[model samples]
Target: STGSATTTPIDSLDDAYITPVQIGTPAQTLNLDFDTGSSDLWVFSSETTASEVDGQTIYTPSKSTTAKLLSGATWSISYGDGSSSSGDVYTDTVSVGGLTVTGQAVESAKKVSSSFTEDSTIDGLLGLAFSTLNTVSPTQQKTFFDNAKASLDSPVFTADLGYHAPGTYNFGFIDTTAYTGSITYTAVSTKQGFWEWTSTGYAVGSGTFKSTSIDGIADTGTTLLYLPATVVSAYWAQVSGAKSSSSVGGYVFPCSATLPSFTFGVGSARIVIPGDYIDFGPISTGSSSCFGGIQSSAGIGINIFGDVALKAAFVVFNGATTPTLGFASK
Candidate 1:
């Protein structure tokens, strides 16, 4: 399983944890970030106009030879990372590890300029969430999983996130090795692209959420845990010896006190975020930089439960078979 990518016929978010997949044949491996947020496979082409693509390797269509494009259709995607790409649509035989799919939808990005190119080693991104976002001849289609669901053994996909890398998440097969128990799932709110989320509260420095409520969204894409100003202030105030500082665009705080552990409600489920995750550095937004975990995103609608939260739980993205999200202890 590649980081933040999934090939299984699971719900949209199934692509959140798995990514940075290798799409081409082994002899011509192309490192890519698999996204569920968008539908399509995009790689920087040798014909790209940008002078620098963040050092990402270009995948020349001529090299693949089998690539085919959809007439008149184009593709473009932007991410929270402040990067985007646009290109022509195509279809080709795509492979992930030992699995292969013929005539799959792809995006041969002819114009791409984003930080994704300079910051990482990935060659491009392969979107494997749902088919609605795929750009192809026949609009409103299904994805690889949607088409291959019948061929899957259990019709379910599981994610095993690697402990070391922040973005690493595995897919295709579910690893029941961790637990044998199960819990009922409350379907997610489908309005926001299948981003079903709920939160109970948060804790900092040995204090439970005694002063406030922290409403949040379980967003795997969010890189940081953005907190409301009230939540952040309340949390920092409770921490003994906690001190605040400034950053380039925000505030950072550092504290020697131990942060408390608590659970945020996911429907009726309670998922815990360990204290280790709360102990962040350079927490204050100052020239000197303070250290803290929760950042103040007041009035930002919801606090995002990013990789830090998803990694702590065995999240299920059941789409093809059940279209549900369930969590088990890791």
Candidate 2:
């Protein structure tokens, strides 16, 4: 069946938007981060160390009659921020919105890094990336979306991640009310199991949009935007008091600086990011210095259009054919 779900944003961190998902027989509901960056539907389970769970919800497989272990199966995944989780595997019925998939592999974490244990708003991650990136050994598992797509009207999902507000994730169809203007489409390369595409060029403020092409991935799991050091440096140059602070990390500027807008090219469309959003709060609560939301992804091989960049536009992760993407101003 085709359906959609409302993704609620946690007011505290402003980092991720989570959606409710039901797993197993009687329906064990859990708030999960819908991450497009990686492929693995893992959660805090009974197997996880009690100390690592904090206040997060745990998935209890024993309570669900439908739960069955995938013999000798295991999973491990590490993120760009160094956060990681390793777990055993369980096959069970999974439901999202009104759609359901039987025997979907759910990775139940036995060990998680401090990054996950500390912030307990989300119980786990529901990976929307290609199944090729799934961390399960011997045989990779299909994501909930991949399993549900066969019965869907269309193999498509839309991510409407708002700025400090709750957004919706639509499946099978695009909600016309969620976005305005024409949706500019771009061809994606799933070669690395990511929604990767090339930006024709970018510019600082109202400066001329150049023709430098940059390859980047659209990641819902990442909190900040990342580009090359040169690009980040140039943008900071436009801000009078901006300086790269190794101690504080990345670039920092006077909180009072009149920041300029940043623009990126998507085909013939030009998406603009407001200046105020770039000033990612103060370096410290009591400090007047503000940390920049955009950083250098130079060593990472590809730039990342994280929450900072994504919330500025309406994004469509189309799996219909060739895995294309569509971006529009909301």
Candidate 3:
């Protein structure tokens, strides 16, 4: 009742994580972004408009005997970054790693935004959030994880994200060897349909920890670490040639400047994000200015602890009646 799959980052910047997912009877495999921030298992498929298909593989439900069209069901979703797709729904047999879930709800794309079509590396998204956030209508559907949790050895999943290497998404039991030290658990607020939790505070480099309560979501789907402007500026202060520039896009510093590590307090444990991880590649092909992985979330309303932060620790998404999230040093 346990399954584990290797999840890979799309690019060096760690834009998103993609895993190979098998759908339908003949096992039509497609690369999908495992998005914990959303609740829809939509995929690029034969249903997608020919103009938007680009070069990505699509699932043809007609080929799978187990596939059943959900009559009159439809779904549409727009991401935080504005990428969106929508279309018909079907229930089919889906497999991830070694776990198989029959009658898994799969959304077939009819139309997709330009951004989604532009990145053919990802065929669709496998939502890992709560079923409450599912967008399917006329009988909303549950996410792949939601349907699989009941059969899991433990109603939980662990995320081991890496900077430039491959990581893993483990279902059922925690892989103790994947992480170090004790795991610190925190209460989660699922009313908003996210694995949202609050940080006691954050510290820049070796400075003292701030006592402010910073609430944010643990979103593996997002790339950057977005925080309040105040916290962002505090981290920028340590770099010698850093500046917040809209023209340059977000915070940037000289490529040669040394970046200070960022630390956030989770319960009694503090997870430190190494300095090198914050130095996002150069702004341009060979430019001397480089972008910072951490930026201001003033416009985003809520802070997002994205891949930049998750790469620093091992994360656990528990599916208990009263769910909780856990973090550990890796």
Candidate 4:
């Protein structure tokens, strides 16, 4: 069976996308971030501490007849800062759009870091990346996409994200109306448990396109675009007042600076991100200068074509036995 769901930006900055998902027997609905960067279907739940719960919609397995604890199974997702979110694991009937997975792993959170708890809009994360990234142990588990792929008409899912608006996520089949022109399909590497691909080249605004292949992941979970320092400076340099200050974190510039659009190539197809999407927002409330959405991935290791890049066009995460990715203009 195929499925379609609406994903909405949580904030004006387009920080993250959230989609409604149904879980449990009677179907408890929750808004979750459909993350492609990580592969662990975790959620704020009855198991979470009251202090850490905040205002999130928690999952209660005890209220569902279909929920069963996975024996000796537990999961802990780590962050770059060495902090983590950990919990127990359960298999429950989970549904997204119209597709259902009867025994999908649902990691119930017991402890979540501040970065996660503070985001009251996101109740949980539904990982779409490869199951290899699943943190559950004794035995790892398949993600919702992975579990439902077999029932899909096409073993693929598409992400059609919008700027400051709502978009759609379709499982099993592509919605032709969601895109225009034609799609440029590329091979994907699951080596890093991500939808990793190498961009043919990139151009900043009207600048010439440089023939540099940059490897990055299509991460819906991430907020901004991250690239090599050379590629990053190339764009920021074009903006007269831009500066990468340590105090301000990454690149920041005058709020009024005339920013240029950024573009990346898939084979011969070029997807362009508008300047407004790059301007992000103020460094702090009422701040005059704005932070940049494109930053150097540097120590982060992997460059990311996150929301800033994904929302520029329609993206397809093909989950065939021989995985592939498709990008198209919309």
Tell me the tens digit of each residue's lDDT in model 4 across 115-188: 78888999999999999999999898999998888888989999999899999999989888888999999989
lDDT of each: 0.55, 0.89, 0.92, 0.92
- Which lDDT value does model 3 have at 294? 97
Write the number of the candidate with greater lDDT, choosing between 1 and 3. 3
**lDDT of model 1, residue 161:** 45
Question: Which segments of candidate 1 are over 4 A away from where they belong?
Answer: 1-20, 25-27, 133-144, 163-172, 179-184, 200-217, 227-233, 240-247, 255-262, 279-293, 296-303, 320-322
**TM-score, each model?**
0.75, 0.96, 0.98, 0.98
Candidate 1 on 16-51: residue-level lDDT in tens? 233434444333466665454555677776666666
**Pairs that clash in candidate 4:** none
Question: TM-score of the candidate numbered 2?
Answer: 0.96
Give the poorly placed runs of model 3, Cα more than 4 Å off.
none
Q: Superpose all Cα atoms of candidate 2 onto the true structure and report the RMSD in Å to 1 decimal.
A: 1.3
Tens digit of lDDT per residue, candidate 3, span 216-329? 999988889999999999999999989999898799999998889999989989999999999888898999999999999998888999999998999999998899999999
Instruction: Report the Cα lDDT for residue 172, model 3.
Output: 91
Cα-based RMSD of the predictions, in order?
5.6, 1.3, 1.0, 1.0
Clashes of each: 36, 0, 0, 0
Candidate 2: tens digits of C-alpha lDDT, residues 1-330? 676788887754466788999999999999999999999999999999989999899999999999999999999999989999998999999988888899999999999999899978889999998999999997889998898888888888888887777888878888888888989999899999999998888989989988898899999988889999999998999999899887987889998898999998899898898987687778778899988988888767789999888888889899986789899988
Q: What is the lDDT of candidate 4?
A: 0.92
Name the 10 consecutive residues with the lowest summed lDDT in model 3: 8-17
